[model samples]
Target: MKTAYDVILAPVLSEKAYAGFAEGKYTFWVHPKATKTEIKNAVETAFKVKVVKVNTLHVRGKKKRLGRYLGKRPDRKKAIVQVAPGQKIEALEGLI
Candidate 1:
């Protein structure tokens, strides 16, 4: 059951995400309903690499315009996938 192409939404491209580079962790915005087992399997197929661990956290949306009306953002979830044995995925070169 490795049908997670859409499961792996997008890679996080930011300073905080890059900060975990030393830990060999790759962050991505994944499907909130997707399970950890599916996530690891998805990474294994999508990135074609062995995954060591899969961690997830949800980010609460905040105001957009300084406490003004009609100022809201959508909530999102993040999945931090770690590769086994420090193997770097070259697909990252094309993406963030």
Candidate 2:
């Protein structure tokens, strides 16, 4: 089943990630081939949380050169996961 989640890959960890967490939102580095609905479901199921909203962005891969070899990293997708009102996950807490 190529559900929303299957397309989504994993969480994104960075300063921005921490910002999202602090704002009561989870961040994910999704597959380049995922859709909005799939991303939404995946977050809901994987985190066992009710998702209130979903947002996505397509990030182009970076270009790199290794001593005469030139290539570009694979493109990546990202999403912000916002939990439903009144729903809370303690594990996601205590970080702030």
Candidate 3:
């Protein structure tokens, strides 16, 4: 069984993500195997906040060339969580 901590790896810190902060939207890097429902539950349980919606996306890895060899980055999954209005995740706030 996956715990909340395992499901949520870390908060995404980017200019685009920070733009949504004012609107109660938060972004996170989640486990590659975690589903939207599981992410929602984890966020709610861990943060003690009501989640309005959860959006997920798969990020393709970029290919790279090193000398005569080629390599690829690991694929990652991201989640955009919208919490109830006027609510916030304190952990993320400190990261800003």
Candidate 4:
């Protein structure tokens, strides 16, 4: 069974991802616990597109200091997905 944590939210149309999309790449902001296969399936199922490859990135949040106090930010997960040729996902269109 796939748990709630198995799937994650998609990324907004950021500048970097927009560039990637034009080059046949798509990006998503995934769950910290989601695996590569889970991410790939999620993108394909959610967008109704075929995914060729999925790449994940662990982003450690930054540290902030306020009035002599120091704090660390939250961590995040990012996924770079490449769809099959001739398959396009409309989710990113016009949002750039």
Q: What lDDT does the true structure give each of the candidates?
A: 0.69, 0.66, 0.76, 0.71
List runs of model 3 lying over 4 Å from the truth: 61-71
Tens-place lDDT per residue, model 3, 1-96, is: 353666767788778888776677778888787888888888787777877988878754445444455555556788888888888877677787
RMSD of each: 2.9, 3.3, 2.6, 3.0
Q: Report the alpha-carbon TM-score of model 3 versus the true structure.
A: 0.79
- Clash count, predicted structure 3: 0
Query: What's the residue-level lDDT of 73 in candidate 2?
Result: 52
Query: What is candidate 4's TM-score against the reference?
Result: 0.77
Best by lDDT: 3
Per-residue lDDT value at 8 in model 4? 48
lDDT of 1 by residue, 1-96 (tens): 454465667677667767674566777777676687777877788788877888878754455444665646555667788887758755554465
2 against 4, candidate with superior TM-score: 4
Model 3 lDDT-worst window of ten: 60-69
TM-scores of the candidates are: 0.74, 0.70, 0.79, 0.77
What order do you get sorting by TM-score, best first? 3, 4, 1, 2
- Candidate 3, overall lDDT? 0.76
State the TM-score for model 2.
Answer: 0.70
| Number of the top-ranking candidate, with TM-score as the measure | 3
Kindly list the per-residue Cα lDDT of model 4 for residues 1-96, writing each as its tens digit.
342235648564778888788866777777787888888777766676787888888755444334455544446788878888898778886665
Model 2, stretches more than 4 Å misplaced?
1-5, 62-70, 88-96
